[PDB]
Structure 1
Amino acid sequence: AWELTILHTNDVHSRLEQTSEDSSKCVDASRCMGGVARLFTKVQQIRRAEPNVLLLDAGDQYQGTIWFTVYKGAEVAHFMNALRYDAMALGNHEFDNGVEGLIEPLLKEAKFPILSANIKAKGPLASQISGLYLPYKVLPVGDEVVGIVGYTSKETPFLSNPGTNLVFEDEITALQPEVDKLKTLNVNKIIALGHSGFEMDKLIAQKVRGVDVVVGGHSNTFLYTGNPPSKEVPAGKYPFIVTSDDGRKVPVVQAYAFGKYLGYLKIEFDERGNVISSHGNPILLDSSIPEDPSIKADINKWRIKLDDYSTQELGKTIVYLDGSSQSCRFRECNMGNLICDAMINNNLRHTDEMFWNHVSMCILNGGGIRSPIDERNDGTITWENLAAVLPFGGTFDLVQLKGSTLKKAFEHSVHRYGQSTGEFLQVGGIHVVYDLSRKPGDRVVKLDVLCTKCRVPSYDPLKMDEVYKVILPNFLANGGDGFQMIKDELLRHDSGDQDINVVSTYISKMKVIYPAVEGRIKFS
């Protein structure tokens, strides 16, 4: 009975330090979770009990908190070396700072293999990057060998900044030949480790012959078998079992995000690489598991550089600024309302006497709100708090749109509602009412907008023919999140201030904030 124990994180997103249960900054240490020091402790506990253990990361360590803004990746390489990871697949956000943002910080410093089989470099890059990332890696595990093939999101050119000298092929098309090569090398146990979302994960397990396990990410999927230990709601059992086209039962696993859970899968292999059985569950890394002192001290040695971003208090908040995905991708959220009001507050300028201000409206992709902010620490908001909410460093731009163009974006906002996708829109100066029973593209039942050509701002139904000015993220003006209609049909695009400075300025102007949910978005 050859047993393998796969440990896997994904979408850790720079939460090196322990976090609150909402993955925001750790306020009350007696209830905090995650961290790489607590992960070390738990990983060790298992490497002692089990002889055959592999530790894998399925992408998206980059971006999320002030840890990445400063060290820009070097912190990721250091503490993944300290955790002695056995392999890592590349995610889209690993290209957030371009290829150069990945080679010098991460690739050149990792002491473990970094994998991606559907990325191929060309031109000046093929010599600069050759050998720094592999399509697969055959790892020794005891007296056997396990092959691990990497894959990265086909859509990463649209999601990030890979550059024009990197081609991203269809995952299944590129993975299949690499798996066949490993089989011809007499490797009968093969793991697919990648970053394309749960739905592609299930397709890779169904169509790629010879994949025994798929360990994925990118969709922050929580799977659990039984009664779950925390707030996260499971999308299915752990592992999710896929029956391949050639007749095999192929487990598919993922461990949410933000370092909260450690995926734990046990696989019973026969002598020929057949999977007899698979069982496990993600392990909640709560306060019961102590942080390893040696890693924690190295954390604090690196933590002294970051305390320069929590020195200055920008303002206070007396409400919970709910920027969780469970809210801002499903309903109106007060962090969404906060961010939009500050966007409108920044574009206030004198104009014609037949107007009160040139722009009265705001839209904001919920997926762009990347973290909540707790108020129980005497409500203080520092730059560190804001850098977790708006980590990407985009801008807040002025656009101009036709009533019909806006109507299509709000139909798109809910065209696949229910899957926790980022395109759900938070709004300002807009009152939208949805009806999901109606068919996609015909679910905006009401859409009223705040008038600009009026001495008293008031709400008036959207007119398709009219033309409106909107403050939106740079991410959306360029067609992000599937908002092609915006990128195509806009009548004007003026660039604006930094998204983090716009929100830093408006919180100091107000000194104390209490944004509410007031019906800007409603459901029939």
Structure 2
Amino acid sequence: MWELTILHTNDVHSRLEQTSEDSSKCVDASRCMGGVARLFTKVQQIRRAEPNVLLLDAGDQYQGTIWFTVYKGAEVAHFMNALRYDAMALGNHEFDNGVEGLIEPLLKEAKFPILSANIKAKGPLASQISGLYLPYKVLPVGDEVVGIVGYTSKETPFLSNPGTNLVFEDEITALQPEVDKLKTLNVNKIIALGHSGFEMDKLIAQKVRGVDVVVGGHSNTFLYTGNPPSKEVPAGKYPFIVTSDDGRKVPVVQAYAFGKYLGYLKIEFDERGNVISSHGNPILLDSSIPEDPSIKADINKWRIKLDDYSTQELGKTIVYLDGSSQSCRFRECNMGNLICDAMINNNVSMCILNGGGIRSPIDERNDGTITWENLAAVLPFGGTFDLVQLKGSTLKKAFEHSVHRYGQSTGEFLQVGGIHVVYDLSRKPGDRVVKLDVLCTKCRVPSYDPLKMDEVYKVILPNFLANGGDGFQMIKDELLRHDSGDQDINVVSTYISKMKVIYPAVEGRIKFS
């Protein structure tokens, strides 16, 4: 009989400073949430109350806000060290700044094991990272040992910039020998901590024999048993119970994203390291839990650098800039419309944009003041808006891909400019596009004329889509001409200043049967 409490965050994405209800910049501080300082209070509060506790992270601490743009990992290592994190799995966004952008700020400065069993190293890089990350860590909790095995998304080479001298083996295949190794090492209790998404977490739980619990991330999954405290609608109960082939009931947990919730999972274990009972719920980190003062003071010490890099007004918004996943990945969101307008205004009649790239909404309640900061949250990656030459057939395929797996918060949903697309989800994937009228360019007056397969159109789109990202291989493998455009933020920054006061709308660009 042993009691362990697992506390977990996943996909925080640089929300060190407290955010709004929608994870945008904290506007109303009385009705504000999350943050590293507020989490310190709840973590500390749990730590004293429970006997054996583990604060874990399932990746994606990188990107999302100006904190990352400025410190590039210095904030993550400093504040995760401050919060005394027990362990963290490598996320796909941890490789965004190349291999050194992982080695120099985080891997060298972290006072905690950073894990990953399915990443193997070769050649020059082989000895550089050797020992900086481990496949597993056997933490001594009380008078028991707990083995944590890490894993990072198999698709990280596509999804980010991990490098050429790192190899991403299959999760379940690379995890099993490491779990079996730990079992022989008399490690009765195995947590698997990884960044591969909910569906992959569930088969890990069902397939990897010996994993007592799965703590994942990547997909921003929100799980809840009961009536949720906020706008987040749950995908299942907390914990999600997977019945392994072993005959065990393996709990699977996720904490949404942006440090809005601290995942709490209490576990009763037997003499042999088997879950007898488990229960919990992700704790909503809201104003009812005070931000720890000493830790918040350090955030303010690290804020004056961030202040200079976004302490002035660029434009004003009278509409709420809806840059939320719930809207931008399922329907035409006004933020996507704004960015597309900004793109064409920077030069072409068509713009295409992956909803996945819309990382943050912008709140108009702060009188509409749109600062450099509000916006480096919407566009945190520093890509560009590149010119392309596409065939009508090529564009029809991309729209077909746009809703190929619709309804799974995937980022391949397109936000458009100068395109009027209508979808029918009742039909089979591959024949769901019902209309695609595009804005004419040879014409003297622009009018929407249906797309012709055999005609060549000039579309402006992010570097990510030109690179063939989000599975848009047809764009990369069928384009006629690609051109290096201007920096993504500066396209929206120059447009906002030019407009002075903005007000985009859902005007029927994307429609559904």
TM interval, shorter chain, is: over 0.9
- Indicate conservation of the 8 Å contact 1:239/1:279, yes or no: yes
- CA deviation vs aligned residue, 1:423-467 (integer Å, no higher than 9, x gap): 000000000000000000110011100000100000000101111
- CA deviation vs aligned residue, 1:4-56 (integer Å, no higher than 9, x gap): 10000000000100000100000110011001000000001000010100000
Query: How far has the Cα of 1:277 moved from its partner?
Result: 1.1
Q: Which residue is equivalent to 1:450?
A: 439
Q: Aligned to 2:5, what secondary structure does the other structure show?
A: strand
Give the Cα–Cα distance (whole angstroms) in 1 for the partners of residues 28 and 181 of structure 2: 51
- CA deviation vs aligned residue, 1:301-359 (integer Å, no higher than 9, x gap): 00111101232211111000000000000000000000000100112xxxxxxxxxxx1
Give the Cα–Cα distance (whole angstroms) in 2 for the partners of residues 258 and 327 of structure 1: 17
The reply on whether 1:508 has 2:497 as its aligned counterpart is yes
Query: How far has the Cα of 1:285 moved from its partner?
Result: 0.3
Give the Cα–Cα distance (whole angstroms) in 1 for the partners of residues 294 and 451 of structure 2: 60
Q: Which runs of 4+ in 1 moved over 6 A?
A: none
Query: How far has the Cα of 1:481 moved from its partner?
Result: 0.4
Query: How far has the Cα of 1:126 moved from its partner?
Result: 1.2
Give the Cα–Cα distance (whole angstroms) in 2 for the partners of residues 277 and 424 of structure 1: 40
Give the Cα–Cα distance (whole angstroms) in 2 for the partners of residues 236 and 300 of structure 1: 37
The alignment-based identity, stated in percent, is 100
Gaps of 5+ in 2: none
Q: Aligned to 1:124, what secondary structure does the other structure show?
A: helix
Q: Aligned to 2:486, what secondary structure does the other structure show?
A: coil
- CA deviation vs aligned residue, 1:88-133 (integer Å, no higher than 9, x gap): 0000000000110011100100000000000011001111111100
Name which of structure 1's ranges 113-122 and 306-315 shifts more when overlaid on structure 2. 306-315
- Indicate conservation of the 8 Å contact 1:4/1:53, yes or no: yes
Q: Which residue is equivalent to 2:487?
A: 498
- Indicate conservation of the 8 Å contact 1:365/1:423, yes or no: yes
Query: How far has the Cα of 1:274 moved from its partner?
Result: 1.2
Query: How far has the Cα of 1:259 moved from its partner?
Result: 0.5
- CA deviation vs aligned residue, 1:225-257 (integer Å, no higher than 9, x gap): 010000000000111111111111000000000
Give the Cα–Cα distance (whole angstroms) in 2 for the partners of residues 11 and 209 of structure 1: 27
Q: Which residue is equivalent to 1:234?
A: 234
Query: How far has the Cα of 1:288 moved from its partner?
Result: 0.5
- Indicate conservation of the 8 Å contact 1:191/1:213, yes or no: yes
- 1:7-156 equivalent positions in 2, closer than 5 A: 7-156=7-156
- CA deviation vs aligned residue, 1:467-502 (integer Å, no higher than 9, x gap): 101000000011100101111000010110000000
The partner residue of 1:520 within 485, 509, 513 is 509
- Indicate conservation of the 8 Å contact 1:264/1:281, yes or no: yes
Q: Aligned to 1:485, what secondary structure does the other structure show?
A: helix
Q: Aligned to 1:31, what secondary structure does the other structure show?
A: coil
Give the Cα–Cα distance (whole angstroms) in 2 for the partners of residues 462 and 212 of structure 1: 54
Q: Aligned to 2:458, what secondary structure does the other structure show?
A: strand
Give the Cα–Cα distance (whole angstroms) in 1 for the partners of residues 25 and 153 of structure 2: 29
Q: Aligned to 2:327, what secondary structure does the other structure show?
A: helix
TM-score normalized by structure 2?
0.99
- Indicate conservation of the 8 Å contact 1:430/1:447, yes or no: yes
Give the Cα–Cα distance (whole angstroms) in 1 for the partners of residues 144 and 119 of structure 2: 28
Q: Aligned to 1:342, what secondary structure does the other structure show?
A: helix
- Indicate conservation of the 8 Å contact 1:309/1:382, yes or no: no
- CA deviation vs aligned residue, 1:367-422 (integer Å, no higher than 9, x gap): 10000000111100110011000000000000011101000100100011101100
Give the Cα–Cα distance (whole angstroms) in 2 for the partners of residues 216 and 290 of structure 1: 27
Give the Cα–Cα distance (whole angstroms) in 1 for the partners of residues 20 and 261 of structure 2: 13
- Indicate conservation of the 8 Å contact 1:267/1:278, yes or no: yes
Give the Cα–Cα distance (whole angstroms) in 2 for the partners of residues 509 and 301 of structure 1: 34
- CA deviation vs aligned residue, 1:181-220 (integer Å, no higher than 9, x gap): 0000111100000000001000100110000000000000
Give the Cα–Cα distance (whole angstroms) in 2 for the partners of residues 372 and 309 of structure 1: 20
Query: How far has the Cα of 1:148 moved from its partner?
Result: 0.1
Q: How many residues align?
A: 512
Give the Cα–Cα distance (whole angstroms) in 2 for the partners of residues 490 and 220 of structure 1: 33
Give the Cα–Cα distance (whole angstroms) in 2 for the partners of residues 116 and 216 of structure 1: 12
Q: Which residue is equivalent to 2:471?
A: 482
Give the Cα–Cα distance (whole angstroms) in 2 for the partners of residues 136 and 21 of structure 1: 35
- CA deviation vs aligned residue, 1:115-164 (integer Å, no higher than 9, x gap): 00000110011111111000000000001000000000000000111110
- Indicate conservation of the 8 Å contact 1:364/1:473, yes or no: yes
- Indicate conservation of the 8 Å contact 1:329/1:367, yes or no: yes
Give the Cα–Cα distance (whole angstroms) in 1 for the partners of residues 267 and 360 of structure 2: 35
Give the Cα–Cα distance (whole angstroms) in 2 for the partners of residues 478 and 307 of structure 1: 33
- Indicate conservation of the 8 Å contact 1:34/1:259, yes or no: yes
Q: Aligned to 1:79, what secondary structure does the other structure show?
A: helix
The reply on whether 1:380 has 2:369 as its aligned counterpart is yes
Give the Cα–Cα distance (whole angstroms) in 2 for the partners of residues 303 and 405 of structure 1: 46
Q: Aligned to 1:495, what secondary structure does the other structure show?
A: strand
- Indicate conservation of the 8 Å contact 1:220/1:254, yes or no: yes
Give the Cα–Cα distance (whole angstroms) in 1 for the partners of residues 159 and 102 of structure 2: 16
Give the Cα–Cα distance (whole angstroms) in 2 for the partners of residues 279 and 15 of structure 1: 27
Query: How far has the Cα of 1:518 moved from its partner?
Result: 0.3
Q: Aligned to 1:503, what secondary structure does the other structure show?
A: helix
Give the Cα–Cα distance (whole angstroms) in 1 for the partners of residues 311 and 92 of structure 2: 32
Q: Aligned to 1:306, what secondary structure does the other structure show?
A: helix
Give the Cα–Cα distance (whole angstroms) in 2 for the partners of residues 197 and 294 of structure 1: 34
The partner residue of 1:367 within 356, 366, 369 is 356
- Indicate conservation of the 8 Å contact 1:18/1:33, yes or no: yes
